Enzyme design. Sequence first.
Site, PDB file in Angstrom:
ATOM      1  N   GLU A 153       7.875   0.812  -4.001  1.00  0.00           N
ATOM      2  CA  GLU A 153       7.315  -0.249  -3.097  1.00  0.00           C
ATOM      3  C   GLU A 153       7.243  -0.068  -1.750  1.00  0.00           C
ATOM      4  OE1 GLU A 153       7.410  -3.053  -6.392  1.00  0.00           O
ATOM      5  OE2 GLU A 153       6.520  -3.056  -4.629  1.00  0.00           O
ATOM      6  N   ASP A 211      -0.033  -6.905  -1.764  1.00  0.00           N
ATOM      7  CA  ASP A 211       0.306  -6.076  -2.666  1.00  0.00           C
ATOM      8  C   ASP A 211      -1.174  -5.469  -3.757  1.00  0.00           C
ATOM      9  OD1 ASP A 211       1.784  -8.404  -5.230  1.00  0.00           O
ATOM     10  OD2 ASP A 211      -0.157  -7.942  -4.826  1.00  0.00           O
TER      11      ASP A 211
HETATM   12  K   LIG Z   1       4.681  -3.020  -2.068  1.00  0.00           K
END
Ligand SMILES: [K+]
Length: 164
Positions: free
Chosen positions: A11, A20
């Site tokens: 992430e 995202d």
């Molecule tokens: K991310």
Amino acid sequence: MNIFEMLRIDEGLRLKIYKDTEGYYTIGIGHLLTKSPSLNAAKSELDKAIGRNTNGVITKDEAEKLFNQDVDAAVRGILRNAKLKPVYDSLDAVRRAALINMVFQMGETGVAGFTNSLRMLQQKRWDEAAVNLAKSRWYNQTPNRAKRIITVFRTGTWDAYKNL
Ligand SMILES: [K+]
Ligand SMILES: [Cl-]
Ligand SMILES: [Cl-]
């Protein structure tokens, strides 16, 4: 290596609101704020999550706080899910981390829909599970990450995250 370090690699860490891979506002270590296209809606979610009026920016400690919550929530969700719990309980610790990672990325519901893959994992049919897992929108949209996760379920080792 452990679930925290693994997801920190997958992430990343960004202290300002960003979008995202799906185009959704997020912050920190993959903390999804909302699916709404409104930046204001995202900022509202951020403040409610942190407990203060932010400027769409948080501290590292605050990012880690939400991440801890997020990982715990993913585990909790697996345990509450009738389709996921059995598989999770059947796995070794390394593979369990792989399943938690999937749930953090896609949600309990998303993962519980991988019925066939789940069954192969529960049967410990590693190579077949690996092939099946790849037949997904998940793999096609985030192939590098999916490949790492698939290798962990295939091998039961953290080699794919070694040197990242
Ligand atoms: K991310
Ligand atoms: Cl939250
Ligand atoms: Cl990827």
